Amino acid sequence: GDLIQREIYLQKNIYYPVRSIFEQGTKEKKEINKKVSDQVDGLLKQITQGKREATRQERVDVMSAVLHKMESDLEGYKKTFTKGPFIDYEKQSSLSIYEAWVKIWEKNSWEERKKYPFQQLVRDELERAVAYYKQDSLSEAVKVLRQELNKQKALKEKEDLSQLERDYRTRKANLQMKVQSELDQAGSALPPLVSPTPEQWLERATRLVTQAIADKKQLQTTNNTLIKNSPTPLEKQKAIYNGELLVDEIASLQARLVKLNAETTRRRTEAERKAAEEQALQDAIKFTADFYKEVTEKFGARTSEMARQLAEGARGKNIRSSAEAIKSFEKHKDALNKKLSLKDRQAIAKAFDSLDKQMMAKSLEKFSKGFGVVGKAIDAASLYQEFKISTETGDWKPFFVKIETLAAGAAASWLVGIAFATATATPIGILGFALVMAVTGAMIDEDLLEKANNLVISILEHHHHH
Ligand SMILES: [Zn+2]
Ligand SMILES: [Zn+2]
Ligand SMILES: [Zn+2]
Ligand SMILES: [Zn+2]
Ligand SMILES: [Zn+2]
Ligand SMILES: [Zn+2]
Ligand SMILES: [Zn+2]
Ligand SMILES: [Zn+2]
């Protein structure tokens, strides 16, 4: 009724309660950030037990947990406030609030009003006034916590990137050794090789490097997609780094492949040279076999058989001493001087003078190879001259001395090569070739001298007369 009653009602039921709500509301908003910060720290101190400082992850985890609880309370208070219209309590008169409340109440029916009195609505509206200031302070508390949480997340991300850079630099440094270890790992899958030639293990190493290049290039195409479709900068930087590492590895592998290709070529060439050495040996054996045939063609069966027996009888023997040779040759000598004419001596001496040194040297290397005796140094012209002097004079003692000196400690077969090399480079004739074999034979074996000595005499079907 009375205007005093109305003023008492407005003060008691609207102004005095709302003002308290607003006072408590502002008190909470002033202390919320401090209380939120202290719950985070107090909880972090519980996890660590004040023995160590909390990790960035531990900080992010607690702050997120607290924020999720604050956001759910915010939604709750924001739902209650939502149920009615917006009244900015602090800026309204007690009459403004009253008329707003009356309008809300009037929305009901008369029967509704009997079950829900105005005083009941007043109670509900004051609960909604608390809800309004609760959601307002909580909205600010959430904005601050979300900003601090985000900063922490950013710091963590920066820290993760620093360790990613650290892992990369270390890996980058250990490049050469890493590729070697990777190739070995690939190599373990492979079965054992027995007595491998260098060309065999080079082929296997070339296969590992080639496949490692092929696989690393396939990983690079895959990694380019990983960079393009990255969900976070951390996952992108991981891919950027791995991609850099992959190019470094491929280049290391390619450098290795170049060396392998070069070495393989060196090995192949070497094997071709070795194979050409075995062919030269077989061609030397062919040349020795052909020499006997050619001798048969030009001098007949008996001279060739005498050359063949000279070569076979020298096998595994060494050269005798000049004294031995002089003694053996002096024994059978008398007949030779008497049955050998001056014209003969001159014909044999002349042949030796016409001797071709180049073809002689080439034949001696082939015969020496065929007999499997080492290549020996000789001044051929010196040797032949002494042979010629020895043919012209009756004296062979200075010949034997020259051969012993020239070939002391050598195989008897080398002398045979010298004998044979002479027949191929000189117009020596059947007689000269037989005397050469006789002289060579005295330096090897007594029975080889006797056999050749018989051939010389037998060859002397010359017309020696008046
Ligand atoms: Zn306000
Ligand atoms: Zn690697
Ligand atoms: Zn070949
Ligand atoms: Zn022929
Ligand atoms: Zn004898
Ligand atoms: Zn004669
Ligand atoms: Zn005659
Ligand atoms: Zn006579």
Residue numbers in the entry: 40 to 505
Verbatim from the authors:
Pyocin S5 (PyoS5) is a potent protein bacteriocin that eradicates the human pathogen Pseudomonas aeruginosa in animal infection models, but its import mechanism is poorly understood. In addition to its C-terminal pore-forming domain, elongated PyoS5 comprises two novel tandemly repeated kinked 3-helix bundle domains that structure-based alignments identify as key import domains in other pyocins.
The protein crystallized in the P21 space group, and the structure was solved by a combination of single-wavelength anomalous diffraction and molecular replacement to a resolution of 2.2 Å. The first 39 residues were absent from the final model and presumed to be unstructured; we refer to this below as the “disordered region. Otherwise, continuous electron density was observed for the entirety of the remaining protein sequence (residues 40 to 498). The structure shows that PyoS5 is an elongated, α-helical protein measuring 36 Å on the short axis and 195 Å on the long axis. PyoS5 contains 17 helices, the high preponderance of helical structure likely reflecting the need to forcibly unfold the toxin during transport into a cell and the lower forces known to be required for unfolding helices relative to β-sheets. The C-terminal domain (domain 3, residues 315 to 498) has the canonical 10-helix bundle fold of a pore-forming domain found in colicins, which is consistent with the killing activity of PyoS5 (12). Domain 1 comprises residues 40 to 194, while domain 2 comprises residues 195 to 315. The core structural motif of each domain is a kinked three-helix bundle (kTHB). The other striking feature of the kTHB structural motif is that the third helix from each domain extends into the next domain of the pyocin; helix III of domain 1 extends over 90 Å into domain 2, where it forms helix I, while helix III of domain 2 extends over 90 Å to the pore-forming domain of the toxin. Moreover, over half of the 45 identical residues shared between pyocins S2, SD3, and S5 form a grooved surface that runs perpendicular to the long axis of PyoS5.
